[PDB]
Ligand binder design. Structure first.
Ligand SMILES: CCCC[C@@H](CN[C@@H](CCCC)C(=O)N[C@@H](CCC(N)=O)C(=O)N[C@@H](CCCNC(N)=[NH2+])C(N)=O)NC(=O)[C@@H](NC(=O)[C@@H](NC(C)=O)[C@@H](C)O)[C@@H](C)CC
Lengths: 99, 99
């Protein structure tokens, strides 16, 4: 689809069997999701942006369906105010910026 | 152009006659630039990011070029980790997300 930017580019995603709303963020290197349970081992990570840093848990090889498109990659879990789909997964679903 | 997301979508912008680098950010409502001098009066604005909230200076009707495309709008100036071009200006250059 072609998503216009008059409003926040929010889509429904499915991760860990759960349906969540997420923001397609071209300004995010990683994918960050609110507290939830994910399978596998994890390692701590600090991520920053406006307002500073937050500590998150890094999970690898996580599958997530973004607006009907499945992608696999690293997913960070933590106290993010918004569920964010970053570039690591945006590339997988073939998302591009066009103008 | 069509911008893929394998690397950060950084473009050259021109504001106040100066060339700077900025991130095309679909996850940003507004455009936030690092400390610099802009003409006219400014109003207060509080914005939120991944790590919390920061106070910025809001300047309206600022002439700014984004990757060769001219825009005139609101530019927020403050302690942002990176210059980001938000949806307010992305809509002016006719940018869309596509997949
Ligand atoms: C400034 C750093 C680059 C852009 C930034 C945009 N993030 C979005 C995420 C959505 C909110 C959690 C954002 O901050 N958007 C703001 C930008 C400011 C603005 N005003 O446009 C926004 O739209 N804020 C809205 C409100 C959104 C909701 N906020 C809230 N409920 N508190 C607003 N009007 O203030 N990206 C990031 O913060 C990501 N950081 C990065 O990709 C890299 N970090 C750095 C510092 O470059 C990497 C080295 O970690 C985070 C997510 C980790 C992957």
């Amino acid at each position: 689809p072609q998503i216009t930017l008059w409003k926040r580019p929010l889509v429904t995603i499915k991760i860990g069997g759960q349906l969540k709303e997420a923001l397609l963020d071209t300004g995010a290197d990683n994918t960050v999701i609110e507290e939830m349970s994910l399978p596998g081992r994890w390692k701590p990570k600090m991520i920053g942006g406006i307002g500073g840093f937050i500590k998150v848990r890094q999970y690898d090889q996580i599958i997530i369906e973004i607006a009907g498109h499945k992608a696999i990659g690293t997913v960070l879990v933590g106290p993010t105010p918004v569920n964010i789909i970053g570039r690591n997964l945006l590339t997988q679903i073939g998302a591009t910026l066009n103008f």
